[PDB]
RNA sequence: UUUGCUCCACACAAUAUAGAUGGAUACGAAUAAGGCGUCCUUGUGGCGUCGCUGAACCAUAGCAGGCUAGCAACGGUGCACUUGGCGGAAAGGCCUUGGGUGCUUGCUGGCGAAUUGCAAUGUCAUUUUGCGUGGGGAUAAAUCAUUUGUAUACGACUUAGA
RNA sequence: AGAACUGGCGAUGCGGGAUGAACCGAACGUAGAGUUAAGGUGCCGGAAUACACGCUCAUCAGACACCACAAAAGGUGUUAGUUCAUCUAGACAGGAAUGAACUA
RNA sequence: GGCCAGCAUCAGUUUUGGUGGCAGGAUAAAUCCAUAGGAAUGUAGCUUGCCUCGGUAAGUAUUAUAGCCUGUG
C-alpha cells in the first residue's frame, strides 16, 4: 500500500523474511529494511558458526580475488540469503534488487518513519518455544564484522531521542481522547454510532 | 480416509451335497463399500478353504455409532509387521466413535512405526466400561476430576504480508 | 475532491507460463484487496487498461493505452488471468494497471 | 515486605468456558465445551446459538473470558438450561469484544448515501472537538 | 604425485602483491592507542634519510659473553627539521568506518606548502587559499564555527604538518604535508592545542 | 509424554522475601541479596501464600519436566544462600615441598598467590571472585576456608584453585600433590 | 579560441520514465507476557481497562471543483516571509514565535454547467538537457615541449624553470 | 561376457526426473478454447508459508523410484510396544508406583 | 463502405454461483420425550479431626437443592 515499506528486522527468521521479501521487491514494491544486526537464525550458535566457516573455505584456487566474496556485515548476509532467491543475473533480477535497501541499526533518514514487521517472519511466531537460536548480530563478528560497538552506541543515541519524542506524543494523544470524549454523548455523535462510526 | 464401519456376511456356494452353507460375518473398517467387500475376503481367506469365485456375499450394511457424542475410552489390539518380523500391540485411544478412533489408530502407527495400511491387522476394538482397567497414562490423566489447562503461546493467524504493531501471544 | 479515482489498482505479474516455458497470450494480474478465488468472481470481465507514456504525440496527446478484459480466476489467493488485444510487453512485470469497473453488474 | 510474584491470566480449558468458532459453518457462534477428548480436542455444544454437539479440535474456536457451572458430560437438554439461568448470551453482548463484532458488522452494511452522511457528520463532530482542544 | 622432497615455499604471501607504491611517501596505517590521561602530544614526525654511520658503545648485558665490553654497530642517521602546523582534521565514527568531518586551515601559508598544491608552480597566478585567508579577515566567526564543530562531534582529531625542506641540501622545495594523530587529552584539548 | 501438569513447591522462611517477574528471581534475606535471571527454562510461578511458591510446566516432555526440577533446586539454593550462607574448606596435601598460600593485591585485584608447589619457580596467581571471603583457619594444618552467599560463586572459585594445582609429567597416582575440596557446607 | 563561467525566478523547445493517481501514520522492551488510564509509601507496587489484527486512524462534498449573500465561531488549513531551539550514522530534517494573505463543507441562500452527442488515459504527474530574456556573484589551471634521477622496457613516477 | 519372453532406443520430438539415446507420462498437420497425465505448489517458478494426527535437534541432521552407495555391532538420546516379578498386607531411593530381560 | 470498437437478443463449447422438488439406509444413527435398572472421576444431606466463626481431607449416602451411563418404547 506505501509507496515504501520500511521493516524493522529485529527478531525475524532470515530464510523466512528473504521469501517474503524477494518476492515483494518482484511484484514492484520498494523494501527497506532496518536494524539488520537484531535478525535470528534458528539454531544454536556454534552451529551456524560451522556453517559460515564452511562457506569460507570455498575460493577460486588459482585467484582468490575471482571467488566467491565472503561479506562479514549483518545487512550484507541477509543481502546474499536474498540474491539467492532472486533471478540476479537479468535485467529484470536486476532491476527488482535496485529497489531494496538494508542497513544496520536505523539510519537517520529512516529513523522518524513508521515501521512495520512481517508475521509469517517472526521468530517468536515460528519457532517452537525452547528451541536455540542464533542472532545476526554476534555472529557477524565472530567472523570478522568490526562495527558492532559503533552501531550499539548510535542506537543508544536514537532511542533516547525516541523515548523523548514518545513521552511528547502520548501526552498529546491523552488531551485528545479527552476532547472526543467530552465531544461524545452530543447529538452528533448518537447519529455517528448509529451508522458504526 | 475417513473410515467407515461395515457388516459383511458371506458363504460358500451353494452345492446339491451341502446347500444352505454355514454364514459368516466380519465387522470391518473401510472408505467405502468396494474396499470393504475386498477386505472380507482377505481375512476369509486366512481361516477357510474358500475365495471369492467360490463363495458370494449376502449382505453388507454401514454400522452407525450408537452414542456418536459420547466421550468413549477404547482398548484396541492389533498384530503388524514390522521391517523384520511380526508383533502384536495393544493400544488405547480416547475418542466419540469407533470409526474416530481407527483412524487415529491408523495415523499412530505410520507416525511411531512406520507401519502402512497394508501391514496392519485390526484384531479386536473394545470400549473399556470401568476405570481402573486403563492400563496407559497418557490416557489415564485425562481422567482426573476436574481436569483444567491453559494453552500458553497462542499463535494468531494474519491475512496480510505486514503488521504494524508487535504481536502478543497471550491467551 | 482530492481523488478522482474510478479504477481498481492491479500489478502485472508474469504471463501464464510452466517451469521452463512462458504463453505471453495470457497474463497473470494481481489485483489490490482481493485475496480469495470467490472475491475475485466479481472482476471476471471487467475492462483492463495499461497506461503508458511516450515522447512522440501522436493523436493530439502523448498518453497511450493498451485495452484488455478479465477471464478467469487463477490459483486459490485471488490472482486472475487476462488477455489484451495485444499482448502486454515483458518489461511491465510488476507495472501498475487499472481495472474499471464496467461493464456493471449492479 | 512481602513476596511479590506476577500472577498469569491465562483462560482455561474447562467444563462451562464458552467458546467462539471461528472456522467451519457455525463461524461466529457460541458454544459450551461439555467434555475434555485430550490435549488437542474437546467437545462443545450450543443450543441456543444453533451450533450442533460434536467433537472439534481447539484449534477451530478461541476461548473467551466467560464461564459458567456445567456438570461434566451434561447432554444438550441440561445444557440450555444452564445456558439460560446464567444468562450467557447477555454477558457476552456486554463486552468490547462483541461489541467490535457487531460494529464492524454494521459499518460494512452501510450504503452509498449513508456512507455520505458519515463524512458530514464526522466534519461537525470534527468542528467542536478543534474548538474546544484550542 | 607428490614432490620427491620437501622444501619451504619460496617467499612471503603476506607483502602481495609486488607492485609499485602509490605515492613516494609511505602512508601510517596505524596509530598508537590514546590515552587521554595524558598530555597531548604528537604521535609521529618527518624526516630525511641522510646515510649511515658506525659507532662503539659498552654492552650492558648480564650473561652475555660480550657484558660490559665494547661492542662496534651501524646506524641510520635522519635528518629532522622542525615541522609547521597548518591545519587540523575532525573524524567522526561511522558504521562504515571514520569519515572526515572538517578541516580548518591556519591563517598564512609559506610557499613551501603552497608549492604542493600546484604542478606548475612559476606559471600559476599563486591564488590558492586567497580566498579561505579571507575568512579571517573578519573577527573570525567561520573559524570559530568550524573549530566548535569538531569539538563537538569528532573522536579522532589529526593536525596536517608539513617539513621545512628549504633547511635541507635537497633541491627538491616543495615539502612534504602529512597528517598526525594527537593521543592524550579530551577532544576539547586536542583542538585547542 | 507430554504430561498435562507438573508441579513444584518451594518454601520460604519468616525472614526472607522473594520477588518474581518475566522470571527474574530477587532473594533478600538476612544476610544480602541474590538475583538471577531465568529466561531460558519457559516455567510459570505463582504464589499461593507468604511462604510457599509453586513452579509449573504445562504440556511438557520429557526433557522440558526435567529442566523443571533443576529450578526448584536453584532457587532453594538462593534462598539458604541469603539465610546460611556457604562454606567450603580445602586442605593442602604435599609429599616434599610444602605449598605456602597468601593472599596479595595487585592493581586493586584482591589475588591469591600459591607458592613452591612440586619446587615449581612458577608463581600461581587466581583472582578471588565478587562476594567470596577467604580466610585461613587455625588450629588446623594446611587449611582454606571460603565463605560467601551465592554457592555457585563459592564453589567455582574453589573449583579454580584446584585446576591451578594439577600435576604434569607424571603419574598422578603417585604424586598426589595439591590442593583439595575437603567439606561443604553453610556458614551458620 | 571573438562575452566566457556560475546561482536565482519563468519563457519556449527537446528528453525519457522498472511505472504518483487521498496520506511511508516514528517509543522501547517482553512474549510461561504486555499497552493504556489512575492512586500512593515510586515499586519486580495497588486498582481499573484493552487485545482475539490496519476490517484501523487521518483525510474525504464544490467547473480536477466556479461566481456571489448571510449567520455562528476567533477555531481549522494552504502559500510566501519571520523569531528561537534541536538534529552529523547517509545530519539536508523536526519543532517553535509573531504578523500579513488566500480558502473554509460548522450552518443557511442565490446564479453557472448541456453538444465530449450512449464508453474510448480522455491528457491535470517528475527526469534530464538545450536555446533566448534580466537580477546578482567570482576573474584559474592542467597537459605537451624543456629539465631532474630518490624513478624507469615504453607509458608511468619524482623534481626544476617568467 | 552370453541366452529366454516382452517392451523400448536406434529411426523421436513433446511434459516430468536440475542436468542424461533407453526411466515416468504421452507419441507430433496449422490454430482457438476447455480439461488432465507424470510431476509439482516458501523464493528462484506457474500453483495452499493449506488442513490434520504424530515422530526427529545431528560440534559432518534430513529431504522422493531408475540414481549417482553404506554394513556388522552399539547408546538410561527420545518414542511406542512385549514378557515376568515386586507393590493397598508401604516396594524402589536416601508415601506411589518401581525393578529386570527383550522388540523396533 | 474501408479501419477499430460498444450494447442487446440467439446458436455452439465451457467455467463459476444461488435456489426448488424427490428417493434410499437400523424407512439413518443421535438430540428430544416417556419408562426400567445401575454405577462414580459421588450431587444434596449426615458423621468424624485440626481449623483467622466457613474452608478443606475421607466415611456414609444412588437424586434429594447437580447430573450422568445402559436397556426398552
Ligand atoms: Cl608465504
Ligand atoms: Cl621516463
Ligand atoms: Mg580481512
Ligand atoms: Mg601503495
Ligand atoms: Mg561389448
Ligand atoms: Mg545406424
Ligand atoms: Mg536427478
Ligand atoms: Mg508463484
Redesign the pocket.
Same mark, same amino acid.
Given at each position: 500500500?506505501?509507496?515504501?515499506?520500511?521493516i524493522?528486522g529485529?527478531?525475524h527468521l532470515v530464510?523466512?523474511l528473504?521469501?517474503?521479501v524477494?518476492?515483494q521487491l518482484?511484484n514492484?514494491q520498494?523494501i527497506?529494511v532496518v536494524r539488520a544486526e537484531?535478525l535470528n537464525i534458528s539454531?544454536?550458535f556454534?552451529?551456524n558458526k560451522?556453517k559460515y566457516h564452511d562457506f569460507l573455505r570455498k575460493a577460486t584456487a588459482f585467484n582468490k580475488t575471482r571467488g566467491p566474496f565472503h561479506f562479514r556485515a549483518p545487512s550484507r548476509i541477509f543481502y546474499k540469503a536474498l540474491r539467492?532467491?532472486?533471478?540476479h543475473k537479468?535485467?529484470?533480477?536486476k532491476?527488482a534488487l535496485?529497489?531494496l535497501k538494508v542497513?544496520?541499526?536505523?539510519?537517520?533518514?529512516?529513523?522518524?518513519?513508521?515501521?512495520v514487521v512481517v508475521?509469517?517472519?517472526?521468530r517468536?511466531l515460528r519457532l517452537?518455544?525452547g528451541?536455540?537460536y542464533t542472532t545476526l548480530g554476534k555472529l557477524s563478528t565472530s567472523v570478522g564484522w568490526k562495527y558492532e560497538d559503533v552501531?550499539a552506541k548510535?542506537?543508544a543515541?536514537?532511542?533516547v531521542?525516541?523515548?523523548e519524542?514518545?513521552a511528547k506524543?502520548?501526552?498529546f494523544?491523552?488531551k485528545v481522547a479527552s476532547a472526543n470524549a467530552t465531544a461524545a454523548e452530543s447529538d452528533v455523535a448518537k447519529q455517528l454510532a448509529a451508522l458504526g462510526? | 480416509a475417513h473410515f467407515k464401519e461395515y457388516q459383511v456376511i458371506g458363504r460358500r456356494l451353494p452345492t446339491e451335497s451341502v446347500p444352505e452353507p454355514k454364514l459368516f460375518r466380519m465387522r470391518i473398517f473401510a472408505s467405502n463399500e468396494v474396499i470393504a467387500k475386498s477386505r472380507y475376503w482377505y481375512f476369509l481367506q486366512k481361516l477357510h478353504k474358500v475365495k471369492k469365485a467360490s463363495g458370494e456375499i449376502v449382505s453388507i450394511?454401514?454400522?452407525?455409532?450408537?452414542?456418536?457424542?459420547?466421550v468413549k475410552n477404547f482398548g484396541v489390539w492389533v498384530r503388524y509387521d514390522?521391517?523384520?518380523?511380526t508383533?502384536?500391540?495393544?493400544?488405547?485411544i480416547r475418542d466419540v466413535s469407533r470409526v474416530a478412533a481407527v483412524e487415529?489408530l491408523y495415523?499412530?502407527m505410520?507416525?511411531?512405526?512406520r507401519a502402512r495400511f497394508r501391514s496392519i491387522h485390526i484384531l479386536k476394538v473394545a470400549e473399556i466400561e470401568?476405570?481402573?482397567d486403563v492400563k496407559?497414562q497418557?490416557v489415564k490423566q485425562?481422567?482426573?476430576?476436574?481436569?483444567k489447562f491453559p494453552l500458553?503461546?497462542?499463535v494468531?493467524?494474519?491475512?496480510?504480508t505486514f503488521?504494524?504493531?508487535?504481536?502478543?501471544?497471550?491467551? | 475532491?482530492?481523488?478522482?479515482?474510478?479504477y481498481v489498482?492491479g500489478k502485472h505479474?508474469?504471463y501464464?507460463?510452466?517451469?521452463?516455458?512462458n504463453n505471453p497470450?495470457?497474463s497473470?494480474i494481481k489485483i489490490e484487496g482481493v485475496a480469495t478465488p470467490?472475491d475475485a468472481?466479481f472482476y471476471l470481465g471487467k475492462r483492463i487498461?495499461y497506461?503508458?507514456?511516450?515522447?512522440?504525440e501522436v493523436?493530439?496527446?502523448?498518453?497511450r493505452?493498451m485495452?484488455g478484459?478479465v477471464?478467469?480466476t487463477?490459483?486459490?489467493?485471488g490472482?486472475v488471468?487476462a488477455?489484451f488485444?495485444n499482448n502486454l510487453?515483458?518489461?511491465?512485470?510488476?507495472?501498475?494497471v487499472?481495472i474499471?469497473l464496467?461493464?456493471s453488474n449492479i | 515486605t512481602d513476596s511479590?510474584v506476577?500472577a498469569?491470566?491465562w483462560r482455561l480449558v474447562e467444563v462451562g468456558r464458552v467458546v467462539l468458532i !471461528?472456522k467451519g459453518q457455525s463461524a461466529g457462534k457460541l458454544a459450551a465445551i461439555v467434555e475434555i477428548i485430550?490435549?488437542? @480436542?474437546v467437545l462443545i455444544d450450543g443450543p441456543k446459538a444453533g451450533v450442533?454437539?460434536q467433537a472439534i479440535?481447539?484449534?477451530?474456536v478461541?476461548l473467551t473470558?466467560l464461564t459458567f457451572?456445567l456438570?461434566?458430560?451434561?447432554?444438550?437438554?441440561?445444557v440450555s !438450561?444452564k445456558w439460560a439461568a446464567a444468562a450467557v448470551c447477555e454477558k457476552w453482548a456486554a463486552?468490547?469484544?462483541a461489541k @467490535?463484532?457487531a460494529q464492524?458488522e454494521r459499518?460494512?452494511a452501510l450504503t452509498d448515501f449513508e456512507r455520505?452522511q458519515?463524512?458530514?457528520l464526522?466534519?461537525?463532530k470534527?468542528?467542536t472537538v478543534?474548538?474546544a482542544?484550542? | 604425485s607428490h614432490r620427491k622432497y620437501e622444501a619451504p615455499r619460496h617467499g612471503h604471501l603476506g607483502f602481495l602483491p609486488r607492485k609499485?607504491a602509490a605515492?613516494?611517501r609511505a602512508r601510517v596505517k596505524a596509530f598508537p592507542k590514546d590515552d587521554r590521561s595524558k598530555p597531548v602530544a604528537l604521535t609521529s614526525f618527518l624526516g630525511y634519510k641522510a646515510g649511515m654511520t658506525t659507532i662503539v658503545r659498552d654492552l650492558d648485558r648480564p650473561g652475555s659473553k660480550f657484558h660490559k665490553r665494547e661492542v662496534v654497530e651501524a646506524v641510520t642517521v635522519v635528518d629532522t627539521p622542525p615541522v609547521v602546523v597548518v591545519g587540523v582534521v575532525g573524524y567522526?565514527?561511522?558504521?562504515?568506518g571514520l569519515?572526515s568531518?572538517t578541516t580548518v586551515w591556519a591563517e598564512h601559508l609559506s610557499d613551501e606548502v603552497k608549492?604542493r598544491?600546484?604542478?606548475?608552480?612559476?606559471?600559476?597566478?599563486?591564488?590558492?587559499f586567497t580566498?579561505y585567508s579571507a575568512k579571517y579577515a573578519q573577527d573570525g566567526a567561520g573559524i570559530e564555527r568550524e573549530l566548535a564543530?569538531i569539538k563537538?562531534?569528532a573522536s579522532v582529531v589529526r593536525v596536517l604538518v608539513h617539513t621545512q625542506i628549504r633547511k635541507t641540501p635537497?633541491?627538491?622545495?616543495?615539502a612534504?604535508l602529512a597528517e598526525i594523530q594527537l593521543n592524550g587529552g579530551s577532544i576539547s584539548e586536542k583542538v585547542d592545542w | 509424554?507430554?504430561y498435562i501438569q507438573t508441579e513444584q513447591q518451594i518454601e520460604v522462611p519468616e525472614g526472607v522475601t522473594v520477588?518474581?517477574?518475566?522470571?527474574?528471581?530477587?532473594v533478600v534475606g538476612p544476610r544480602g541479596t541474590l538475583?538471577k535471571n531465568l529466561?531460558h527454562?519457559?516455567?510459570?510461578?505463582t504464589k499461593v501464600n507468604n511462604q510457599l511458591i509453586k513452579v509449573?510446566?504445562?504440556?511438557?516432555?520429557?526433557?522440558?519436566v526435567?529442566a523443571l526440577r533443576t529450578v526448584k533446586s536453584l532457587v532453594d539454593n538462593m534462598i539458604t544462600g541469603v539465610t546460611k550462607g556457604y562454606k567450603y574448606k580445602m586442605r593442602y596435601v604435599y609429599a616434599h615441598f610444602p605449598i605456602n598460600v597468601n593472599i596479595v593485591e595487585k592493581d586493586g585485584a584482591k589475588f591469591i598467590e600459591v607458592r613452591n608447589f612440586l619446587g615449581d619457580k612458577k608463581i600461581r596467581n587466581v583472582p578471588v571472585r565478587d562476594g567470596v571471603t577467604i580466610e585461613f583457619s587455625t588450629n588446623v594444618k594446611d587449611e582454606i576456608v571460603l565463605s560467601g552467599n551465592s554457592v555457585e560463586d563459592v564453589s567455582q572459585n574453589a573449583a579454580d584453585l584446584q585446576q591451578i594445582c594439577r600435576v604434569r609429567n607424571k603419574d598422578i597416582r603417585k604424586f598426589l600433590d595439591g590442593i583439595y575440596v575437603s567439606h561443604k557446607g553453610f556458614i551458620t
Amino acid at each position: 500500500v506505501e509507496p515504501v515499506v520500511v521493516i524493522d528486522g529485529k527478531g525475524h527468521l532470515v530464510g523466512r523474511l528473504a521469501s517474503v521479501v524477494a518476492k515483494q521487491l518482484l511484484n514492484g514494491q520498494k523494501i527497506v529494511v532496518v536494524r539488520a544486526e537484531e535478525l535470528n537464525i534458528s539454531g544454536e550458535f556454534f552451529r551456524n558458526k560451522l556453517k559460515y566457516h564452511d562457506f569460507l573455505r570455498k575460493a577460486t584456487a588459482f585467484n582468490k580475488t575471482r571467488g566467491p566474496f565472503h561479506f562479514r556485515a549483518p545487512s550484507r548476509i541477509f543481502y546474499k540469503a536474498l540474491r539467492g532467491m532472486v533471478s540476479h543475473k537479468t535485467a529484470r533480477g536486476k532491476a527488482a534488487l535496485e529497489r531494496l535497501k538494508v542497513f544496520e541499526g536505523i539510519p537517520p533518514p529512516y529513523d522518524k518513519k513508521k515501521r512495520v514487521v512481517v508475521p509469517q517472519a517472526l521468530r517468536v511466531l515460528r519457532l517452537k518455544p525452547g528451541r536455540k537460536y542464533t542472532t545476526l548480530g554476534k555472529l557477524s563478528t565472530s567472523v570478522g564484522w568490526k562495527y558492532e560497538d559503533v552501531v550499539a552506541k548510535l542506537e543508544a543515541k536514537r532511542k533516547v531521542s525516541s523515548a523523548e519524542y514518545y513521552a511528547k506524543k502520548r501526552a498529546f494523544t491523552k488531551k485528545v481522547a479527552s476532547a472526543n470524549a467530552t465531544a461524545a454523548e452530543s447529538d452528533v455523535a448518537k447519529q455517528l454510532a448509529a451508522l458504526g462510526y | 480416509a475417513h473410515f467407515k464401519e461395515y457388516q459383511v456376511i458371506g458363504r460358500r456356494l451353494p452345492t446339491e451335497s451341502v446347500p444352505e452353507p454355514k454364514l459368516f460375518r466380519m465387522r470391518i473398517f473401510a472408505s467405502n463399500e468396494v474396499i470393504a467387500k475386498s477386505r472380507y475376503w482377505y481375512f476369509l481367506q486366512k481361516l477357510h478353504k474358500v475365495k471369492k469365485a467360490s463363495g458370494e456375499i449376502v449382505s453388507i450394511n454401514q454400522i452407525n455409532e450408537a452414542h456418536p457424542t459420547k466421550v468413549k475410552n477404547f482398548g484396541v489390539w492389533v498384530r503388524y509387521d514390522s521391517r523384520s518380523g511380526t508383533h502384536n500391540m495393544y493400544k488405547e485411544i480416547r475418542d466419540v466413535s469407533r470409526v474416530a478412533a481407527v483412524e487415529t489408530l491408523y495415523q499412530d502407527m505410520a507416525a511411531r512405526h512406520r507401519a502402512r495400511f497394508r501391514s496392519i491387522h485390526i484384531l479386536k476394538v473394545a470400549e473399556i466400561e470401568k476405570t481402573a482397567d486403563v492400563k496407559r497414562q497418557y490416557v489415564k490423566q485425562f481422567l482426573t476430576k476436574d481436569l483444567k489447562f491453559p494453552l500458553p503461546h497462542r499463535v494468531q493467524k494474519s491475512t496480510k504480508t505486514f503488521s504494524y504493531k508487535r504481536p502478543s501471544t497471550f491467551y | 475532491a482530492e481523488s478522482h479515482r474510478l479504477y481498481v489498482k492491479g500489478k502485472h505479474l508474469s504471463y501464464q507460463r510452466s517451469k521452463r516455458v512462458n504463453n505471453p497470450n495470457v497474463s497473470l494480474i494481481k489485483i489490490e484487496g482481493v485475496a480469495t478465488p470467490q472475491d475475485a468472481q466479481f472482476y471476471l470481465g471487467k475492462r483492463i487498461a495499461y497506461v503508458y507514456r511516450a515522447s512522440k504525440e501522436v493523436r493530439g496527446s502523448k498518453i497511450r493505452v493498451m485495452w484488455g478484459k478479465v477471464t478467469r480466476t487463477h490459483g486459490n489467493s485471488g490472482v486472475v488471468r487476462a488477455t489484451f488485444r495485444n499482448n502486454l510487453p515483458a518489461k511491465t512485470f510488476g507495472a501498475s494497471v487499472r481495472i474499471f469497473l464496467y461493464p456493471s453488474n449492479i | 515486605t512481602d513476596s511479590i510474584v506476577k500472577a498469569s491470566n491465562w483462560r482455561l480449558v474447562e467444563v462451562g468456558r464458552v467458546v467462539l468458532i !471461528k472456522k467451519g459453518q457455525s463461524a461466529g457462534k457460541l458454544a459450551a465445551i461439555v467434555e475434555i477428548i485430550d490435549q488437542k @480436542k474437546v467437545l462443545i455444544d450450543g443450543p441456543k446459538a444453533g451450533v450442533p454437539r460434536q467433537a472439534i479440535n481447539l484449534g477451530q474456536v478461541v476461548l473467551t473470558p466467560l464461564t459458567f457451572a456445567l456438570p461434566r458430560g451434561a447432554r444438550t437438554a441440561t445444557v440450555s !438450561k444452564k445456558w439460560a439461568a446464567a444468562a450467557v448470551c447477555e454477558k457476552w453482548a456486554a463486552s468490547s469484544w462483541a461489541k @467490535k463484532i457487531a460494529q464492524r458488522e454494521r459499518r460494512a452494511a452501510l450504503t452509498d448515501f449513508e456512507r455520505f452522511q458519515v463524512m458530514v457528520l464526522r466534519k461537525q463532530k470534527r468542528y467542536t472537538v478543534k474548538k474546544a482542544l484550542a | 604425485s607428490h614432490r620427491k622432497y620437501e622444501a619451504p615455499r619460496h617467499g612471503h604471501l603476506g607483502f602481495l602483491p609486488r607492485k609499485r607504491a602509490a605515492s613516494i611517501r609511505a602512508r601510517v596505517k596505524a596509530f598508537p592507542k590514546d590515552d587521554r590521561s595524558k598530555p597531548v602530544a604528537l604521535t609521529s614526525f618527518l624526516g630525511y634519510k641522510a646515510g649511515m654511520t658506525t659507532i662503539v658503545r659498552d654492552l650492558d648485558r648480564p650473561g652475555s659473553k660480550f657484558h660490559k665490553r665494547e661492542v662496534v654497530e651501524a646506524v641510520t642517521v635522519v635528518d629532522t627539521p622542525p615541522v609547521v602546523v597548518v591545519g587540523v582534521v575532525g573524524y567522526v565514527e561511522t558504521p562504515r568506518g571514520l569519515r572526515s568531518l572538517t578541516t580548518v586551515w591556519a591563517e598564512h601559508l609559506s610557499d613551501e606548502v603552497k608549492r604542493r598544491f600546484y604542478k606548475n608552480w612559476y606559471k600559476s597566478k599563486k591564488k590558492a587559499f586567497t580566498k579561505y585567508s579571507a575568512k579571517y579577515a573578519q573577527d573570525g566567526a567561520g573559524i570559530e564555527r568550524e573549530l566548535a564543530r569538531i569539538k563537538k562531534y569528532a573522536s579522532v582529531v589529526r593536525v596536517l604538518v608539513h617539513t621545512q625542506i628549504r633547511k635541507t641540501p635537497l633541491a627538491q622545495k616543495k615539502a612534504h604535508l602529512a597528517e598526525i594523530q594527537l593521543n592524550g587529552g579530551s577532544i576539547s584539548e586536542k583542538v585547542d592545542w | 509424554m507430554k504430561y498435562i501438569q507438573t508441579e513444584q513447591q518451594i518454601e520460604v522462611p519468616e525472614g526472607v522475601t522473594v520477588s518474581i517477574k518475566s522470571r527474574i528471581v530477587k532473594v533478600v534475606g538476612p544476610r544480602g541479596t541474590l538475583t538471577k535471571n531465568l529466561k531460558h527454562i519457559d516455567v510459570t510461578f505463582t504464589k499461593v501464600n507468604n511462604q510457599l511458591i509453586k513452579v509449573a510446566v504445562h504440556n511438557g516432555g520429557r526433557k522440558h519436566v526435567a529442566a523443571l526440577r533443576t529450578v526448584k533446586s536453584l532457587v532453594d539454593n538462593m534462598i539458604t544462600g541469603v539465610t546460611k550462607g556457604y562454606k567450603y574448606k580445602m586442605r593442602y596435601v604435599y609429599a616434599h615441598f610444602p605449598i605456602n598460600v597468601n593472599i596479595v593485591e595487585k592493581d586493586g585485584a584482591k589475588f591469591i598467590e600459591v607458592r613452591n608447589f612440586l619446587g615449581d619457580k612458577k608463581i600461581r596467581n587466581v583472582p578471588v571472585r565478587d562476594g567470596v571471603t577467604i580466610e585461613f583457619s587455625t588450629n588446623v594444618k594446611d587449611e582454606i576456608v571460603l565463605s560467601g552467599n551465592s554457592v555457585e560463586d563459592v564453589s567455582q572459585n574453589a573449583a579454580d584453585l584446584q585446576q591451578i594445582c594439577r600435576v604434569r609429567n607424571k603419574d598422578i597416582r603417585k604424586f598426589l600433590d595439591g590442593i583439595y575440596v575437603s567439606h561443604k557446607g553453610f556458614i551458620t
